[model samples]
Target: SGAIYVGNYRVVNRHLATHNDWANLVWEDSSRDLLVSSTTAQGCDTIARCDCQTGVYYCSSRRKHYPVSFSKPSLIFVEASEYYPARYQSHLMLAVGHSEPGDCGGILRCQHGVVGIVSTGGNGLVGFADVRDLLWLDEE
Candidate 1:
C-alpha cells in the first residue's frame, strides 16, 4: 500500500505486509533446523518448521506463539527470511483449510517478496545461512 521497492533489493528487520490469517514459517536442513519466532495479537508466540529435503512443510502452534483469531488481524505477516538467505530458492502459499480466505499460510525462502502487502510497525524479517527451508502452517 505504500511505495513498492520496485526492484530486487534488501531490507532488514522490517515487515512488508499484514494478514488476519495465521501462518507458520520455517527453515531447515540435514545439519540443523532453525525456527523463526512470530507473535499473535493475544500475546501468543510460536515458530514454524520448514523442511529442507522434498520441501515438505510441518507446522505447529506452541505456547505463547499461536496465530490470530476472529479479530481479523490480531497478527500481521511481513518478513525477511534470514535463516537461509544464501540457499533461498522457493516460495510457497500454504493452506490449512480448503476454502475462500481459509487461513492461507505463507512459505517463502530467502528469494521471494510480497509485491502487494500492507505493513505495520513491529513485524520483522528473518532468515539464516546455507540451509534448505520450509514455510509450514499447522492447525495446532
Candidate 2:
C-alpha cells in the first residue's frame, strides 16, 4: 500500500517483500498468524492480526466478521459477504483488483475469498455473487 501502488496494479509493493500498505508492519515481526474476527477490505484501511503462532487471522473492522471457509493453505475472498479461500498459504506474490461501473476507485468490501469470476459472480458481489477478481493481500 505504498503511495506508488495505491493506483498502479503492477507496483507489487516490491512483491510485498520490502513495502506494504500497512506502515506499522515494516519493523514489527508480522510473521505471526491470528484468527479472523471480522471481514476486511482492500488497502491498509483494514487491519488484520496474523497470529503466526495460533495460525488464525483476525479482523477487527468494527463491523462484522467476514464469512470464512476452512480452506487449508489458501485464503478466500468472494463478495463483501463471504470468503472462499485461495491456493497455498505460502505466498511471495499477490496481485488483485476489481471491475468498476465507470469509476476509477472501486468500493471494495472484501471478506476472505476471491471475487469477480463467473463462478464467484461479478460486481456488487451480491449473496455468493460469484466473485474471484478483486483487491489483494500478500505474504512473501
Candidate 3:
C-alpha cells in the first residue's frame, strides 16, 4: 500500500479522508482505551449508528464481507488469513478473526459511520489500523 499524505506530512496509518484543520490534542493519563481527542468545534451532529455485533462491510479495490463488533469498545475484530500479506510492524492494529483475499486498505464501517481501515493480515487475523491515530497528524 502507498502512504497517505495530509498537508505536508505523510500519514503513518491509512485513513479514509484528510482534513487540513484540527482542534486540541487530548490524551489519557494512564489507559489503553481509545478516545476521540479532537473533533470539530461545532460538535458532531450525529454519531455512528450501529449495534454491537453488527455485520459491517469494507471496500478496497472491490467490496467484500467483513463483520465487526463494539464489544471491545476500542477495537473491532474481523475474519482474516494466516498468510499476513500486508506489511505493518511495530504499529498498533486490530486482529481479524478471518478474509476473502483482498481486504487491505479498505475502510471498515458500520451503518453510516467509519470503524477503521485495513492494514495487514497474519495468523488468520487481519490488522486494522485505528482511525484515532489520524488525528495526531492534523496540522491545525
Candidate 4:
C-alpha cells in the first residue's frame, strides 16, 4: 500500500543472495541499481528509532508490506558462530521480535533510514544482518 518514488525509472530486475545465504538484496531499475546501507547503530538502539515508534516497515510472506516495532536491540551468536566462527562477534547480528518466512532480505526501514535486512526469523523474533557490517565486509 505504498510506493518509493525515485525519479521515474521502474525496477526491471532484482538481485538476491543464493545458496541459502542471507545477504545482498538489490534492485536494478531501467537505468540503475539501488541498494540499502546503514552507517551506524547509534540510532537503532531505541524503540523510537528502531521500532514502530518510528513506524518500521518490512515485507511479509504475502509480498505485502507491514509495519512492526523492534522491542529492543539484541545479538544472535549461534548463527555467527556456526557460519563464520573466526569472524563472529556479538554486535554482528541484530534481532527483533515479529517476523516470518519470506521476510528475509527485506529492508527494515525507520524514520532514521535503512536499519538492516531481515535475515533469520524464529522463536518469536527475527535477526538482521547489520548493514554497517555488510559495508565493512565490502571494504575488506
Candidate 5:
C-alpha cells in the first residue's frame, strides 16, 4: 500500500492495498469524505459515502440509500433485516438455488452497520439481517 496521507492519517486505498479486496476508494474533496464503491460478484456496484469526521456512513445499493452508524472503524457486516418474518424463514447462508448469485433479487438495508435483508422474488425470504452478536451456519 503506497502511504497516502489525509491530515496525518495514513490513507488506505486500492493503490496501497492491491491484494486486499477493495473496489473503488477515493477521497472526495467536495464532500470532504471518502467515496467507496465496490462491485458484488454479480457486477452490481455497491457504494458508500463515509464521513471521516463522524462514524456515520451512507450506503447505496440495490437502488436504496441506507444510513449506518459504525461502532468500530473499518468494520461492517453483511446487513439485512426482515420486515415480515412470517412471510419467510429467518436465516442466513447466502442465497440458495440454482439461479445465479446476483440473478435472485432482493432489497438490502444497512443501519449503523447492521444489515436488513428482504426478498422481492419468489424466494420467500424476508426480514433478514446480519447479526454480530451471534453466528450460525444454515444448511439445507
Candidate 6:
C-alpha cells in the first residue's frame, strides 16, 4: 500500500563507483534475481528486493508500488540517451530533471511489464520522469 524508505543507494554516501555507459546484467525472467555488480553505474548499489506476493517493487518517488518484467534473461547494457537509471530496485530506475527537457539527475523507474515505460514521479518526483531507452538491451 505504501513504500518503506530504504536507506540511500550506498551504505557509504561519499564513495561512488564510476561505470561505463553500459554494463551486463544477469536477469532471470521468472526470478527477480537481477544480479548487479557490487559497485556499478557510478557506484550505485543494487537495491534488490522483489515481493513474491505483490509482484511489484517499491518506488520511492511515487510513494507506492510499481511493476517490472523481462521476456528473457537477455544481457542488458546501458543505452546512449539523455537519461539513465542511476539507481535501481527490482526493475525500475528513478529519473529526475528540471521542468526543462534535459538531463539534470535521475533515480529509478520501471520500464517493462504491467507498468510499461512510465514515470513514477508524483510527490517529490513531479519534475522528474521515469523513462526507458536510457538503459536498454532489446531482445529482438
| Best model number under TM-score | 4
Worst 10 residues of 1 by lDDT: 62-71
TM-scores for every candidate against the unseen true structure: 0.17, 0.17, 0.38, 0.43, 0.19, 0.22
| Candidate 2 regions with alpha-carbon error over 4 angstroms | 1-44, 51-66, 72-140
Whole-model lDDT values for every prediction = 0.22, 0.23, 0.40, 0.40, 0.25, 0.26
Model 3 alpha-carbon drift over 4 Å, by segment: 1-55, 59-62, 70-91, 100-102, 136-140
What does candidate 4's lDDT look like per residue over 18-127, in tens digits?
32222423332211112332222222221112333333546666565566655333444434323233323233234445666556556666775555556555776665
- The local distance difference test score of model 5 is 0.25
Clash number for each model:
16, 44, 6, 1, 17, 9
**Superior by TM-score: candidate 1 or candidate 2:** 1
Clashing pairs in 6: 17-42, 17-43, 92-109, 92-110, 93-108, 93-109, 94-107, 94-108, 94-109
Model 3, residue 119: C-alpha shift (Å): 0.8
Model 1: per-residue Cα lDDT over 55-137, one tens digit each = 22111121122221111112223233432232322231222221111111222221132211111112122212211222232
**Decoy 4 TM-score against native:** 0.43
Cα lDDT, model 3, residue 90: 33
What lDDT score goes with residue 89 in model 4?
Answer: 27
TM-score of 6: 0.22
Per-residue error for 79 in candidate 2, Å, reads 22
Candidate 3, residue 107: how far the Cα is off, in Å: 0.8
Q: Choose 2 or 6, whichever is better by TM-score.
A: 6
TM-score of 3: 0.38
Alpha-carbon runs more than 4 Å astray in model 4? 1-55, 71-74, 79-98, 132-140
Kindly indicate the candidate among 1 and 3 with the higher TM-score.
3
Count backbone overlaps in model 3.
6
